[PDB]
Amino acid sequence: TFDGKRMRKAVNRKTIDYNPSVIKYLENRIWQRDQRDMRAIQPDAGYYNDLVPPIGMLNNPMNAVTTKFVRTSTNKVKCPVFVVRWTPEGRRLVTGASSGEFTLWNGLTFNFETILQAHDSPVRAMTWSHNDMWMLTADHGGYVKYWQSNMNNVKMFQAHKEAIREASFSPTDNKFATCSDDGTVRIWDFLRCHEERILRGHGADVKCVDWHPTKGLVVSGSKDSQQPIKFWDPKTGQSLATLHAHKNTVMEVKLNLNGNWLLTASRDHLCKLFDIRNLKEELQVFRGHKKEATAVAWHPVHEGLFASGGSDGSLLFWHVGVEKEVGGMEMAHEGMIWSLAWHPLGHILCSGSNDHTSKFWTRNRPGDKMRDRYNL
Amino acid sequence: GMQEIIASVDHIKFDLEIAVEQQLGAQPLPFPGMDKSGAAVCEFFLKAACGKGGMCPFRHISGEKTVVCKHWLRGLCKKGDQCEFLHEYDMTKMPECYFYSKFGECSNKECPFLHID
Amino acid sequence: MYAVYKQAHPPTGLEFSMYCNFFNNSERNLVVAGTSQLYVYRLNRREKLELAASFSFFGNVMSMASVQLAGAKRDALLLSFKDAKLSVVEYDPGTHDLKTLSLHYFEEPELRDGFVQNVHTPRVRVDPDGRCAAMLVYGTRLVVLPFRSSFLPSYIIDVRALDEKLLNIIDLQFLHGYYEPTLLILFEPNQTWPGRVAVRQDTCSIVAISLNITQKVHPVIWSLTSLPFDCTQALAVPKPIGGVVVFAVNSLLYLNQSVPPYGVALNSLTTGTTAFPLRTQEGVRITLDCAQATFISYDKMVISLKGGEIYVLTLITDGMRSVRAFHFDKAAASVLTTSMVTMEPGYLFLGSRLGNSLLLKYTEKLATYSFEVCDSILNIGPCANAAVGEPAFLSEEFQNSPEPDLEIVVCSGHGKNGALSVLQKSIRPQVVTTFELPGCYDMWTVIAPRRHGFLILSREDSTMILQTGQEIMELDTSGFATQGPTVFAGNIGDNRYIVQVSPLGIRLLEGVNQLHFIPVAPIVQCAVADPYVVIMSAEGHVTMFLLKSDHRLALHKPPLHHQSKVITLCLYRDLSGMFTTPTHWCLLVRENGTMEIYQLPDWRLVFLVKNFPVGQRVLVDSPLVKEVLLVALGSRQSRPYLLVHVDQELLIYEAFPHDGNLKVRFKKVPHNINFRGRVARFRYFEDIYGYSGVFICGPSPHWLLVTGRGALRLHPMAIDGPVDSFAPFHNVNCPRGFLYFNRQGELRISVLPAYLSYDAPWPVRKIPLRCTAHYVAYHVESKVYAVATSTNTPCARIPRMTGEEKEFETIERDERYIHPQQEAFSIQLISPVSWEAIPNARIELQEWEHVTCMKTVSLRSEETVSGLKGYVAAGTCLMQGEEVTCRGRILIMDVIEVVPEPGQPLTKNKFKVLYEKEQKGPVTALCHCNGHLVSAIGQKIFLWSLRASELTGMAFIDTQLYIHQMISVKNFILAADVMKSISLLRYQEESKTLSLVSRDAKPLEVYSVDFMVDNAQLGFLVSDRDRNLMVYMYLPEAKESFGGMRLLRRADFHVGAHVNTFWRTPCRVWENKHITWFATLDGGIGLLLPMQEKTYRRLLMLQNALTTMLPHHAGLNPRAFRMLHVDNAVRNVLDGELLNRYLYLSTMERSELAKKIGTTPDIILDDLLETDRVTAHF
RNA sequence: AUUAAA
Ligand SMILES: [Zn+2]
Ligand SMILES: [Zn+2]
Ligand SMILES: [Zn+2]
């Protein structure tokens, strides 16, 4: 058993500390107008203090292709990790596991901090409100829980009779949408825990749901081949559109914060991108996942860059407008990657796989020979 | 120089100064479960009665607490107003180190918990 | 809620420079541009750049280029503005402004491809033959402007739709020697970054597309595809050799269509990073990552490296012009440059945003070249930080002034050009002595046998004569008409004689002795210039006097037809022959309102203005003007100016040539000077502290200065109140000084302070530090400035964490290895008395320690009679890379008085480090709150109490990612996050609790935060990366804030520049308002003055009228420019630069606009002038 | 004290 009462030798842990990068960026912004005034980082190990966070290198999103392994964070329970989410300030990483527990890992040195039995059933959904107060989680039993930064459960109610796959907040966080295996999306009032509407029409398990960044639009993905993607009006409850985008089981639908793009991952090995203003024609199609595409994550800083996870354990990186993958690791995990979470500074990526571990990936050091197992 | 000298504001009574003193626009705390330990101390509750037991957004504090809250430093204080440990940054009030008191000498000299010897 | 934005200092710092025919095809001009500023310079042969034209834009220039259109007398300027705007402008003869030929918009959402955030600046390129121009838009759309009604319809090329899928364009340049406009594009089809080079090395490519203007086809020729990943700009080689030179970070490449590629390695860092065939260039170990290059002649390129080093690169060729080798010659180092251009052969201009832009002259040595500095354009660099303090040398006569006497010290420049700028807005005289002389109202100083020998005073009914010399004594001896008042007194001839005029007559003086006197309605105004004397009676009768050698004043009655009464006069000699058709001119204003210029020896009319008093913007040939003065200013009195005084309103004109009448026209020039016995308000002076100009007397005294730079300088002098009369004074006790009366009747003998330079927009002293100045803090006690500075040293070790302690790896590389730059931080002490650094008062920090913040903090103490003590607190962090945990120190220093070292009076001040301890995390921001020190340590904000020598933890709160800025008012702390937003915190003293009052939930990359202060409203002013100013308000009862937990923005404004430092002063209606000042990263100073709602609404109607009904430079929209981040919005900030256009209008135009917006010109003028008056600080 | 030492 582990209770914080066992003596062990002091350990100095591996760190990915963003503070030197921010300080360097704070100095450069003073005298550098933008990227074109930025002095080049040399591909040498001695140029360690010239690094800046992704906000510094806006013209080159290739910095945030995080294929440098940092640490593997595994619980002693050894159960699959279904969702990973960063605390809104990046202080901690929270993982939802099949055991129903929340595990907290320190955001600087990725070591265990605390664990709590959050849900009775596996934790399937975990989302933070746009204001940093609220973290909403859902489980395979159909219950939705309200949490705060101090990881104190505040409200509990059963939203669905079946497994809730994903939840998404409205911009003002007054309402949120949940998708379930019962085949319906449901719009909820956060403060009263009351379902405003029930959104029906998919005809099979709804595996993903996303709220539009500003408009008031709900996009859903389902197992149903006839209704793979649907667009909804959360107020009226009506189906605005149906998108026959994938052959099999759309697993993720993520709307880019620019408000224009819909990112879809599916079991047909494909990630597709769409313009919600023009839904008849599909935008770029992303190919390169040998097995199913299971997780996607838009980069918080670079609006065209996103990471993708696969059922084989591959973790690939793509950019909008680039046909091929900008980077990737074919054997990032030994099992299906369920979730990808970016640090608020998009310098660290975390992945939680169907294997009982979660891994942290950072940007590659300038001047290193990427001859490790994950690169070469 | 010294903006405090050339541009003094002590003679000015700002609106938000009145707003926080009068607890202005403070809606009752929903969801009785939560605590909001990063909130201000209720000055109305200190003088006499606030009228919102647990529903007040602000902290209703008590003076019997002597040891600082170890979870509050880590940002994981679930108890909130019903917490027996002081939410203050007094180093003298830090709890005694579990490892220095029992397991001989503590591993890191940088720990904040008090060492007795 | 409501405010008006005013800029007090125009931005300094040049990003673009070019050499083109701006005015005409006979000469070329140096055209430079900055942030929303355009400057045209002539080269005067020591060589000096003298300003010929300056224009302001409602938009920041993103790219500048010039083209010679078909059948044109000038080069059109191609200016690019943020997003997709291309404006084609020319100089306009006639009206001396710019002329917009075409303005193009390419701001459609389709062209953006769904990318809401624009990271690519629009880049304009011009074909060398002038066949077309191209502008690259959003990084993907190539706009083509064909040239021959001088423009053909433009078309857009999608570079993705081309062959080879460019998709990441680094640089694009038109190539020489082609039958069709050929554009070479340097691009990365697959992008990489330094760090993933091991898996993706050679990523850059070039294609040359041949642009068919008519068929609109553009095939690709000459593709290369394995260029090094770190390819920076490319440069097109001129016609004889041709091709392109591609700059890479670590290598240099020459590429031509037929020849195989030629490339060299500039350092050993190319080994594992580039598979391109590279040959080690011998004797050079450099980098070209951020370098400016231009071609001098052919096969010779001058390259300004990062760090300022200048290299001459020679393309060594065979007889048939194929490049076979490179030659590198390291010439002298120079300023950090943003642009470079070649003037006339032998001259090179280095445009600089960091440090002063300087003009170089290169000469071949007796292949190699030597560079020397001929001129420099002053640049208040990126204003990282600013400190307000009081100047040390205020004269004793101004000590009882009620308004505070204070100045600005700015951390400017960067690196080797890092400096401190001492900024004072107004001129403060150094009074030598004061004479209590009542009754006398006007003065004249004359030169006698070039010191001033006599000082002549006019009383109500008597004249007082003072003989100035070793001692100033009154002369009761004869010679001067002391019986009554004197209309005017001056020097006639060549200072040999003295001329004195009274209402009775005109008197000629040899000195103390009178040569002869000529009696002559009473005389009210006299004009003297050269051997010509013109006097005017009260009814407008004009007669002229002339020196004829025997000397003697000779009467010559001017032939003038008095259709209208003459009300004022002026005489002027033209030394530099702008007045084409030493010549002499008389300037005359009639009662009907007509202004006339006359050839002076004869009296023939040359110039005529029908409606002079209204204040027309341009005066072209064919109420109650009170005073008129023509003065020639500049180098050798080259540029003449016209000064006019009408209806308590100052309006001043520049003169420019324009082709038997005078080939000149007058252009109104903007200013913010209001005028709200005949005594002249305009006092021309030559050589006051070596400065030539005009002093304007009145309620707002001003110094008008024009040096050899040719830029109009207007410096206020209001410390002594209104000035009645003024005169130059050159004396043994007053070297090159001046003379004036106060309103109380006090005569001041004064000199200009010597430590300031008055040839800038503000009186400035720039102290070169040779290192980056990060933070400056003024210590009230000991009256000194602390400056946190850093200098670059080679990095020799890589810190590592082995699990026990820090382990350092020595960097072992080849001799051809560029060491990384490591910064060493120092805190210095600067004395305002002598702006040199105080010796033996310098704090050196640890090896990798970076000053993240340094402020003057008032911490409570039991020593002084008050509580607060005022130390200097610095926050530091040890930067050792991502892999090492970053931890910080808090340094609290006191500046103490000590006995100075013998022979070193400056050593009376010294640091006293009361506290310097390692913190449990990085110290990223510092602040003080009610005598407590507030520190952002990691992701927490701590509040400390300072004991004798220890810091005691009082309270903390959990905060966001990275707090880089905190400011506090009373018990409230405003914390700015690097990415999240601003936060509002309060501290309660009774219960030691630090809580979050409110915060802005939306993301925001904040630069700096301050406070907007009203009588009771407190606004949180926020600076942004997108160059926006936001005011947030805490409104708990407002619905938009959920329960007061959301901060709501209540005012929006897009300043064209980044703001990193803030400070606020009280207004000079304005009972408890404070003006929030800021210094921009582009060298400017701006204001944000709170406003009443009614005045805001009135001036908002005025602002809309000025936006709609006035043409603007480059056709830009003032309203769209000040919109929020579109270059949601809460327009509650007025644009004072736009509101200044109302002052620039004529009276008729002002009245018409006022009636259209349904108000009174007097009311609008009252509002505008009140805003100008309340902000007259520094 | 809710896992401070996972
Ligand atoms: Zn209460
Ligand atoms: Zn507690
Ligand atoms: Zn201990």
Output phi, psi for C1105, to 5 deg: -60, -45
Strand partners of residue C304 = C292, C310
Residue–nucleotide distance: B23 CA to D1 C1' (Å)? 32
SS3 A26: helix
Nearest to C597 by CA among C10, C606, C589, C26: C606
Strand D lies under 7 A from the Cβ of residue A357: no
Give dist(CA C1036, CA C1046) in Å, integer: 8
Kindly report the CA angle at B81 between B77 and B85, in degrees rounded to 5? Answer: 60
Which helix H or strand E contains A31, and what residues bound it?
A: helix A19-31
The amino acid sitting at C391 is P
> How remote is the CA of residue A305 from the centroid of ligand 1, in Å?
47
8 Å CB contact between C903 and C928: no
Strand partners of residue C828 = C787, C842
Residue–nucleotide distance: C817 CA to D5 C1' (Å)? 45
* Cross-chain CB nearest to C804 (options A12, A91, A371): A12
- Please enumerate in sequence order all residues whose Cβ is within 8 A of that of C512, keeping only pairs 6 or more positions apart, or say none: C475, C477, C479
Helix then strand then coil, in percent of chain A rounded to 5, is 5, 40, 55
CA A48, A50, A56, A62: dihedral to nearest 10 degrees?
-50
Per the CB < 8 Å rule, is C1060 touching A33? no
Token pair recorded at residue C117 = 């955030």
Annotated resolution, angstroms: 2.5
Euclidean distance between the first and the last CA atom of chain A, given in angstroms as a whole number:
39
Judged by C1' against the alpha carbon of B73, the nearest nucleotide is D4
Per the CB < 8 Å rule, is A362 touching C882? yes
Token pair recorded at residue A40 = 């080049």
* Cross-chain CB nearest to B1 (options C780, C956, C1072): C780
Kindly report the CA angle at A199 between A195 and A204, in degrees rounded to 5? Answer: 125
How many residues are recorded in chain A? Answer: 376
Chain C residues in contact with B60 (beta carbon < 8 A):
none
**B-contacting residues of A 167-226, CB under 8 Å?**
191
* Cross-chain CB nearest to A152 (options B34, B98, B103): B34
In the DSSP assignment, the letter for residue C512 is S
Per the CB < 8 Å rule, is B30 touching A191? yes
Nearest to C117 by CA among B98, A302, A290, A288: A302
Q: Which residue of A has its CA nearest to C274?
A: A43
Chain C residues in contact with B3 (beta carbon < 8 A):
388, 1063-1064
How many other C-beta atoms can be found within 10 angstroms of the C-beta atom of residue C814? 10
Token pair recorded at residue C430 = 């150094």
Token pair recorded at residue C119 = 């990271």
- Please enumerate in sequence order all residues whose Cβ is within 8 A of that of C864, keeping only pairs 6 or more positions apart, or say none: none
Nearest to C484 by CA among C458, C521, C509: C458
CA distance B102 to chain C (A): 24
Residue–nucleotide distance: B79 CA to D2 C1' (Å)? 9
CA A56, A59, A61, A64: dihedral to nearest 10 degrees?
-20
Nearest to C233 by CA among C359, C85, C86, C338: C338
Q: Which residue is nearest to nucleotide D6 (CA to C1')?
A: A112
Q: Which residue of A has its CA nearest to C1024?
A: A29
* Cross-chain CB nearest to A49 (options C113, C879, C959): C879
Strand D lies under 7 A from the Cβ of residue B114: no
Judged by C1' against the alpha carbon of A150, the nearest nucleotide is D2
Residue–nucleotide distance: A145 CA to D2 C1' (Å)? 18
* Cross-chain CB nearest to B34 (options A4, A114, A148): A148
Nearest to C77 by CA among C51, C55, C107: C55
In the DSSP assignment, the letter for residue A88 is T
Q: Indicate the burial class of A235 (C-beta count within 10 angstroms; 0-12, 13-18, 19 or more).
A: exposed
Strand partners of residue C1133 = C3
Strand partners of residue C787 = C776, C828
SS3 A331: coil
Give dist(CA C408, CA C673) in Å, integer: 22
8 Å CB contact between C209 and C223: no
**Residue B63 touches chain A, beta carbons under 8 Å:** no
CA distance A133 to chain C (A): 10
User: From residues 43-72 of B, which are strand D contacts by CB within 7 A?
Assistant: 67-71
* Cross-chain CB nearest to C954 (options B41, B89, B110): B89
Q: Which ligand is nearest to the CA of B101?
A: 3
Give dist(CA A276, CA A186) in Å, integer: 21
Kindly report the CA angle at C323 between C319 and C325, in degrees rounded to 5? Answer: 110
Q: Indicate the burial class of A236 (C-beta count within 10 angstroms; 0-12, 13-18, 19 or more).
A: exposed
HSE at residue C514, side-chain half, CA atoms within 13 A, is 13
Q: Which of B5, B10, B14, B87 to mutate to test the interface with C (most CBs of C within 10 A)?
A: B14
**R_g (Cα) of chain C, nearest Å:** 33
Judged by C1' against the alpha carbon of B79, the nearest nucleotide is D2
Chain A residues in contact with B75 (beta carbon < 8 A):
91, 149-150
Strand D lies under 7 A from the Cβ of residue B115: no
Output phi, psi for C446, to 5 deg: -125, 150
Domain region containing C184? 3-377
In order, the DSSP letters of C152-218 are PPPEEEEGGGSSS---SEEEEEEPSS-SS-EEEEEE-SS---TTSTTT----EEEEEEE--TTT---
CA distance C683 to chain B (A): 34
Per the CB < 8 Å rule, is C1018 touching B91? no
CA distance C37 to chain A (A): 16
Nearest to C1103 by CA among C1042, C1167, C1043: C1167
Strand partners of residue C446 = C454
Residue with tokens 């703001």, as numbered in its chain: C1059
Provide the CA C844 distance to its chain's centre, in angstroms: 33
Angle between helices C1147-1156 and C1093-1109 (to 10 degrees): 110
In order, the DSSP letters of A196-218 are EEEE----S-EEEEEE-SSS--E
Q: Which residue is nearest to nucleotide D3 (CA to C1')?
A: A3
Strand D lies under 7 A from the Cβ of residue A117: no
Per the CB < 8 Å rule, is C820 touching A42? yes
Give dist(CA C996, CA C975) in Å, integer: 10
Per the CB < 8 Å rule, is C1013 touching B7? yes
Give dist(CA C773, CA C788) in Å, integer: 6
Residue with tokens 């089981």, as numbered in its chain: A249
What order do you get walking across the sheet with A101-106 strand by strand?
Answer: A81-86, A92-97, A101-106, A112-117
**Residue A150 touches chain B, beta carbons under 8 Å:** yes
Give dist(CA C540, CA C524) in Å, integer: 9
The amino acid sitting at A57 is M
Helix then strand then coil, in percent of chain C rounded to 5, is 5, 50, 45
Output the CA–CA distances (angstroms, integers) from residue C832 to C393, C398, C719, C779, C829, in the order listed.
9, 18, 20, 11, 10
Q: Which residue of B has its CA nearest to A3?
A: B98
Per the CB < 8 Å rule, is C114 touching A108? no
Judged by C1' against the alpha carbon of B84, the nearest nucleotide is D1
Between B and C, how many CB-CB pairs are < 8 A? 114
Chain B residues in contact with C957 (beta carbon < 8 A):
38
Residue–nucleotide distance: A289 CA to D6 C1' (Å)? 34
8 Å CB contact between A139 and A164: yes
Give dist(CA C318, CA C500) in Å, integer: 78
> How remote is the CA of residue C481 from the centroid of ligand 3, in Å?
97
How many residues are recorded in chain C? Answer: 1178
Strand partners of residue C578 = none
Nearest to A83 by CA among A67, A109, A103: A103
Give dist(CA B60, CA C26) in Å, integer: 83
Experimental method: cryo-EM
Nearest to C222 by CA among C251, C176, C255: C255
* Cross-chain CB nearest to C877 (options A19, A260, A365): A19
How many other C-beta atoms can be found within 10 angstroms of the C-beta atom of residue C973? 27
Which helix H or strand E contains C1118, and what residues bound it?
A: helix C1118-1121
Nearest to A315 by CA among A138, A68, A118, A108: A68
The CATH number for C174's domain is: 2.130.10.10
How many residues are recorded in chain B? Answer: 117
Output the CA–CA distances (angstroms, integers) from residue A278 to A241, A261, A274, A275, C325, in the order listed.
11, 10, 8, 5, 55
Euclidean distance between the first and the last CA atom of chain C, given in angstroms as a whole number:
26
HSE at residue C268, side-chain half, CA atoms within 13 A, is 9
Residue–nucleotide distance: A72 CA to D5 C1' (Å)? 19
In the DSSP assignment, the letter for residue B29 is P
Q: Indicate the burial class of B111 (C-beta count within 10 angstroms; 0-12, 13-18, 19 or more).
A: middle
Q: Which ligand is nearest to the CA of B111?
A: 3
Chain C residues in contact with A329 (beta carbon < 8 A):
none
SS3 C398: helix
How many other C-beta atoms can be found within 10 angstroms of the C-beta atom of residue C449? 9
Kindly report the CA angle at C698 between C695 and C699, in degrees rounded to 5? Answer: 130
Q: Indicate the burial class of A351 (C-beta count within 10 angstroms; 0-12, 13-18, 19 or more).
A: buried
In the DSSP assignment, the letter for residue C819 is P
Strand D lies under 7 A from the Cβ of residue B13: no
Domain region containing B15? 1-60
- Please enumerate in sequence order all residues whose Cβ is within 8 A of that of C508, keeping only pairs 6 or more positions apart, or say none: C492, C497, C498, C499, C500, C514, C515, C516, C517, C518, C551, C552, C553
